[PDB]
Nucleic acid binder design. Structure first.
Ligand SMILES: [Mg+2]
Lengths: 105, 673
DNA sequence: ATCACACTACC
DNA sequence: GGTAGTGTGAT
């Protein structure tokens, strides 16, 4: 369900998606990141055909994060037609996420 | 004998006013203060002590008070004033000789805190005086609601300053008597505070006379400075700066930037167990924030934790960064340091081998980058860079502690002119060429001066030959000047080539271990105990020398010091480095008396020391001197005279090995190597 | 072996 | 602004 992005696929997979893309900038060594990961898996299904959950590991793809000024992780960037609509930093709960999306959608 | 000290408005380089001075006369047992308008009288009292053939005691007077008074007398009173060398005693010079195992703050230029070991108390008080006077000044000001500026405490004379001047003399006197109570340097049967200068020098240990002459000569060398080619170094700086940039561009392309945890306060705890996870990065739990009612543009949400991070760019000067990237490339560290980090120096880097050919090539760029920074920091960007120290007269006036090392060797600093890159190293020729007599134009004719570079020949090996003559009857010494000791050591060590021997011996004398020894030994590092064993076996005199040195120091210690060529005690730090201590100390003392005699001989030949004269000492780097000469004819005379003085020194101390010097004439340090 | 000083990284 | 930790520059 979730889209595993790379630096080279980010432009076309995210910026030119034209649909609803929630991106999660994460790292294997971040405690909070490990927390929202399970959540996102559930959000992907429930919002299938309404939103697209994509993840970008910042150790593996060091080029994209800087362009967005990431200062903390996990970072949730909700892209709409190639632009940043909403934004949220931190391991939200299943409820907090449902609210973030439902609202911003 | 009188003890004195002065207070003036600035360091020697820019002093213009005498503020006050104090004199304690042993013959009257009294202290007399001299205020600004008593300057002439102050000078008269010092010259009266000289007329009586007396002694004037200063603490650091050789480098400061004495030349300062000459300068000040000329500027303020139009008077010619020159205290003769033989009438002056310096307790700092005396302290550095008698307490040669202890460090000092070099009169407040070095912070006491970073210095290892203990510090002699009175000398510590003297070195802190300027800082303490400053602190008083500042708090006395604040009391009056006034502001404090740069170093305004030295602009005008005041009574607090007078009180500190008096304190310096009470402390200097105390220091003087404590040093004078060392029977090893001063025979107890003589009251040295009650004798003429000639008696003081002849009745005390030779080391005392030698150290004062060395500090007097080197003080002048500091005043002379080393002609420096600023433009040439500013251009080298542009060249190195562009190469540094290009290497940075190439490296940050090969090794991309990454993210690291930073700014976290709260410990991350397992959400299930609640168990603290110290190994995980720190986090920050947003105090406020919510989803939405007008949506909340805020990105944070109360309760939802996150890991604060920073973006870090690859830094070639970071061994940590280099260590991280090379391992992520497959490098498995073979040797680590005592703290948990793997060794990342030019040697290991030279042996690293990774798969990716690009990252493999990036290693050389990294080694180049490090060497470039080393040059940039030393010549331009470092705190003590040459470009920050070049004075208005176009010269760098490096400082020298004439007896800074335990062995009797001198130490150099601000900047250290004893660590200029050699011609045999990258950019060495350009660095070296920037220091030279050619960069000084004659004050009258405007013509460049010439440089005379002279160094003692194989001094270390001859000192060894000397001390082993008692065991081999001059054999080793005989081979040095009439055969080939390098082939001789080669055979004794069983080493391959003759060049292996030069590396082995010079290394054997400067420490080194079996690893370094066995290293160039063809290759086979380690197991270099065989080479270092077969050697001492076929050169029994050396082993014998070592045995005698030990029977003198141990059994717990019988004695913790070695007697130097001039009688001084030379603290031995380790029974294993004892022979080294003995040899380095002898080389140091030979070279010290040598530069002294060389200058005395030039002066007895009619040559004047100074830029307004015939020659000028520019640098003394252990076993070599660089001297500036007005003409080539003078350069040749200096070269010849340095050889005579070296031979005079060898004869002076009955050396069992003939001592020699080699001299080269040219425009700068690069040509006089 | 003796010693100066630079640059990173942490407080 | 000051301290370690590591390394390089020279004899
Ligand atoms: Mg003084």
């Amino acid at each position: 369900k979730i889209i595993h992005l790379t630096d080279d696929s980010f432009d076309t997979d995210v910026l030119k998606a034209d649909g609803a893309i929630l991106v999660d900038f994460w790292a294997e060594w971040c405690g909070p990141c490990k927390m929202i990961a399970p959540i996102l898996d559930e959000i992907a299904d429930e919002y299938q055909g309404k939103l697209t959950v994509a993840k970008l590991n910042i150790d593996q793809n060091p080029g994209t994060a800087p362009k967005y000024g990431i200062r903390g992780i996990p970072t949730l960037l909700l892209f709409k037609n190639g632009e940043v609509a909403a934004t949220k930093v931190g391991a939200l709960s299943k409820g907090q996420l449902k609210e973030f999306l439902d609202a911003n959608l | 004998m009188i003890v004195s000290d002065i207070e003036a408005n600035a360091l020697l380089e820019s002093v213009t006013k005498f503020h006050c001075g104090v004199i304690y006369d042993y013959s009257t047992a009294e202290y007399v203060s001299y205020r600004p308008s008593d300057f002439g009288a102050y000078l008269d009292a010092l010259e009266a002590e000289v007329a009586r053939g007396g002694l004037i005691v200063f603490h650091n007077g050789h480098k400061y008070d004495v030349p300062a008074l000459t300068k000040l007398a000329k500027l303020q009173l139009n008077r010619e004033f020159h205290l003769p060398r033989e009438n002056c005693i310096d307790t700092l010079v005396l302290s550095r000789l008698i307490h040669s195992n202890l460090k000092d703050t070099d009169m407040g230029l070095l912070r006491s805190g970073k210095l290892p070991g203990a510090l002699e108390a009175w000398g510590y008080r003297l070195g802190e005086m300027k800082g303490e006077y400053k602190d008083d000044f500042k708090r006395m000001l604040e009391e009056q609601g006034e502001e404090y500026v740069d170093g305004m405490e030295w602009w005008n004379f005041n009574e607090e300053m007078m009180d500190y001047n008096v304190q310096d003399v009470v402390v200097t006197k105390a220091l003087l008597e404590k040093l004078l109570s060392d029977k090893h340097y001063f025979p107890p049967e003589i009251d040295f505070t009650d004798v003429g200068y000639t008696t003081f020098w002849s009745e005390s240990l030779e080391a005392v006379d030698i150290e004062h002459r060395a500090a007097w000569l080197l003080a002048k060398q500091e005043r002379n400075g080393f002609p420096f080619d600023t433009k040439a170094i500013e251009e080298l700086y542009v060249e190195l700066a562009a190469r540094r940039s290009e290497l940075l561009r190439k490296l940050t392309e090969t090794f991309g930037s990454w993210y690291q945890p930073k700014g976290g306060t709260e410990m991350f705890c397992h959400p299930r167990t609640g168990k603290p996870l110290p190994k995980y990065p720190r986090i920050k739990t947003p105090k406020v924030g919510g989803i939405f009612c007008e949506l909340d543009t805020r990105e944070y949400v109360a309760g939802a934790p996150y890991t604060p991070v920073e973006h870090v760019v690859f830094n070639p000067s970071s061994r940590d960064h280099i260590q991280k990237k090379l391992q992520e490339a497959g490098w498995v560290p073979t040797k680590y340091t005592d703290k948990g980090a793997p060794v990342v120096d030019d040697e290991v880097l030279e042996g690293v081998r990774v798969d990716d050919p690009e990252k493999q090539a990036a290693i050389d760029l990294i080694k180049e980058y490090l060497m470039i920074q080393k040059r940039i920091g030393q010549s331009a960007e470092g705190d003590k860079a040459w470009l920050r120290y070049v004075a208005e007269d176009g010269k760098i006036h490096g400082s020298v502690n004439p007896n800074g090392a335990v062995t009797g060797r001198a130490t150099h600093a601000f900047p250290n002119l004893a660590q200029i890159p050699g011609v045999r190293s990258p950019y060495g020729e350009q660095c070296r060429a920037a220091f030279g007599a050619e960069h000084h134009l004659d004050g009258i004719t405007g013509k460049p001066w010439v440089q005379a570079g002279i160094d003692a020949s194989g001094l270390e090996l001859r000192c060894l030959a000397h001390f082993m003559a008692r065991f081999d009857n001059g054999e080793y010494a005989h081979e040095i000047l009439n055969g080939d000791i390098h082939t001789k050591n080669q055979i004794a060590a069983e080493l391959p080539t003759r060049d292996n021997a030069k590396t082995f011996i010079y290394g054997f004398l400067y420490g080194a271990g079996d690893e370094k020894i066995g290293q160039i030994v063809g290759a086979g590092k380690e197991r270099g105990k065989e080479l270092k064993k077969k050697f001492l076996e076929n050169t029994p005199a050396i082993a014998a020398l070592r045995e005698s040195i030990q029977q003198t120091l141990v059994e717990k210690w019988k004695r913790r010091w070695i007697k130097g060529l001039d009688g001084r005690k030379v603290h031995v730090r380790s029974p294993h480095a004892a022979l080294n201590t003995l040899l380095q100390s002898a080389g140091a003392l030979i070279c010290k008396l040598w530069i002294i005699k060389t200058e005395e001989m030039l002066v007895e030949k009619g040559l004047k020391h100074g830029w307004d004269g015939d020659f000028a000492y520019m640098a003394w780097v252990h076993d070599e001197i660089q001297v500036g000469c007005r003409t080539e004819e003078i350069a040749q005379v200096v070269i010849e005279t340095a050889q005579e003085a070296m031979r005079w020194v060898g004869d002076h101390w009955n050396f069992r090995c003939l001592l020699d010097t080699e001299g080269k004439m040219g425009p700068n340090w690069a040509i006089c190597h």
